[PDB]
Amino acid sequence: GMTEYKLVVVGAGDVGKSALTIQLIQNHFVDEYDPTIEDSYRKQVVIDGETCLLDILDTAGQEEYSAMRDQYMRTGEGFLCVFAINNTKSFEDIHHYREQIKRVKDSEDVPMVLVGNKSDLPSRTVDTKQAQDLARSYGIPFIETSAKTRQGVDDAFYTLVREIRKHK
Ligand SMILES: C[C@H](Oc1ccnc(-c2noc([C@@]3(C)CCCc4sc(N)c(C#N)c43)n2)n1)[C@@H]1CCC[N@H+]1C
Ligand SMILES: Nc1nc2c(ncn2[C@@H]2O[C@H](COP(=O)(O)OP(=O)(O)O)[C@@H](O)[C@H]2O)c(=O)[nH]1
Ligand SMILES: [Mg+2]
């Protein structure tokens, strides 16, 4: 049967989680997507010659640590932790997202990719070296993306699938 991979996109508001997701789903850059909409979106894709079904949860809204929200996030098999390369605060938030993923998955070994989005913009405030070194600290891949140009989009999502495959 066709394997389904449940991927969850997390990170600060405004980093481009929705734009990245929609580039994967629609193959279109959407510069405006209601910042409060949290939803999941499926798409069949070929990854290393194997058709699989991606189910991508694009997170949004208020930080909440209820049992219900933990259970919803626990359905994720792998996580994209997204910051924007022109927003230092979004990068400084990453460790919090990673810690919460480790907690809900009750595992030090959750499939994960660090994503530095908005790589098309000149206003960089987070050095590539610093982001690469954070991914190294965590032992995870780092992918530079742009939802605007499609740079890195498949790399980010497909790497996460490959990481889930390895973990399984
Ligand atoms: C960085 C923070 O801000 C926000 C703002 C919005 N969201 C978060 C946030 N942290 O983890 C999560 C996820 C969605 C990630 C996947 C696993 C779980 S499990 C569960 N229950 C979750 C939730 N809510 C999550 N989201 N954090 C700073 C720092 C602390 C104060 N705060 C202002
Ligand atoms: N230049 C540029 N703008 C982006 C990119 N991704 C998202 N944006 C913009 O960043 C803002 C927030 O994007 P959105 O997808 O809503 O972020 P979310 O809150 O993480 O879902 C919007 O103004 C988008 O147009 C990108 O890669 N490049
Ligand atoms: Mg959004």
Q: What are phi and psi of 21, to 5 degrees?
A: -60, -45
Whole-angstrom distance, CA of residue 103 vs CA of residue 96: 11
Cα distances (angstroms) measured from residue 69 to each of 102, 109, 122, 141: 15, 21, 36, 26
- Domains along the sequence of the chain with CATH: 4-167 (3.40.50.300)
User: CB of 19 within 8 A of CB of 147?
Assistant: yes
In the chain, the amino acid numbered 106 is: D
> Using a CB cutoff of 8 Å and minimum separation of 24, what contacts does 93-100 make?
93/11, 93/12, 94/11, 94/134, 97/10, 97/11, 98/138, 100/73
Identify the three-state secondary structure at position 144: strand
Helices (H), 16-116: 17-26, 67-74, 88-92, 94-105
In terms of phi and psi (left: phi > 0; alpha: psi -120 to 50; beta: otherwise), the region of 152 is left
Binning the chain into helix, strand and coil, the percentages to the nearest 5 are 35, 25, 40
Does the beta carbon of 101 lie inside 6 Å of ligand 1?
Answer: yes
Ligand 1 atom nearest residue 8's Cα: 16
User: CB of 116 within 8 A of CB of 131?
Assistant: yes
According to DSSP, the β-strands at 112-117 and 50-58 are unpaired
Which residues have any ligand 2 atom within 6 Å of their CB? 13-19, 31, 33, 35, 117-118, 120-121, 146-148
Whole-angstrom distance, CA of residue 162 vs CA of residue 136: 18
From 57, 97, 105, the mutation candidate for ligand 1 (largest count of ligand atoms within 8 A of CB) is 97
CB contact set of 37 (below 8 Å; sequence gap of 6+): 18, 58, 60
Which ligand is nearest to the Cα of residue 62, counting in written order?
Answer: 1
- Ligand 3 centre and the CA of 8: distance in Å? 12
User: CB of 94 within 8 A of CB of 83?
Assistant: yes
Please give the method by which this entry was determined: X-ray
Reference 26, options 70, 56, 62; nearest CA is 56
- Ligand 2 centre and the CA of 168: distance in Å? 32
CB contact set of 165 (below 8 Å; sequence gap of 6+): none
- Ligand 3 centre and the CA of 21: distance in Å? 9
Strand partners, 55: 6, 42
In the chain, the amino acid numbered 148 is: K
Q: What are phi and psi of 4, to 5 degrees?
A: -100, 135
According to DSSP, the β-strands at 142-144 and 78-84 are unpaired
Whole-angstrom distance, CA of residue 26 vs CA of residue 42: 11
What Å resolution does this PDB entry report? 1.0
Does the beta carbon of 97 lie inside 6 Å of ligand 1?
Answer: yes
Classify residue 2 by its DSSP letter.
P
- Ligand 2 centre and the CA of 47: distance in Å? 26
